[PDB]
Amino acid sequence: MIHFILLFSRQGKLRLQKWYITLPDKERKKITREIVQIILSRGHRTSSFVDWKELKLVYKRYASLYFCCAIENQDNELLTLEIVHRYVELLDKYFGNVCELDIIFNFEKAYFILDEFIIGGEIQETSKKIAVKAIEDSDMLQ
């Protein structure tokens, strides 16, 4: 299960945050700052995997805004990257040419998509079209 997910920009600003572990607000802020510093202080050939606090911190940013995850040392490392890619593809399909501008203004939509996709740090829907259809149906309810 993913302990937490933090979508941070290249400048260090965070556009999304979803932690599945109940942590203090100050402790959560410190952890986010440390993760941003580690990711921002890492090269492009670091393997996209960092063992921070015994957590397989996987970073894979496809644009200026980066992505982070906190996977426990009990599952495969490529699974987190595949899940991140699937989530990015689903968000792009739901939004349509998703960019950094739409992420800040449409943070509620991204949060709803993440909630409908991954709940409690585990995967909720393996397919990419069923989740999109469910999100569209929920949005169309009003």
Binding site: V88, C99, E100, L101
Partner: peptide, 10 residues
């Protein structure tokens, strides 16, 4: 800018 670019460009 660098923000208007698509995350995956699909």
């Amino acid at each position: 800018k660098g923000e208007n670019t698509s995350l995956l460009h699909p």
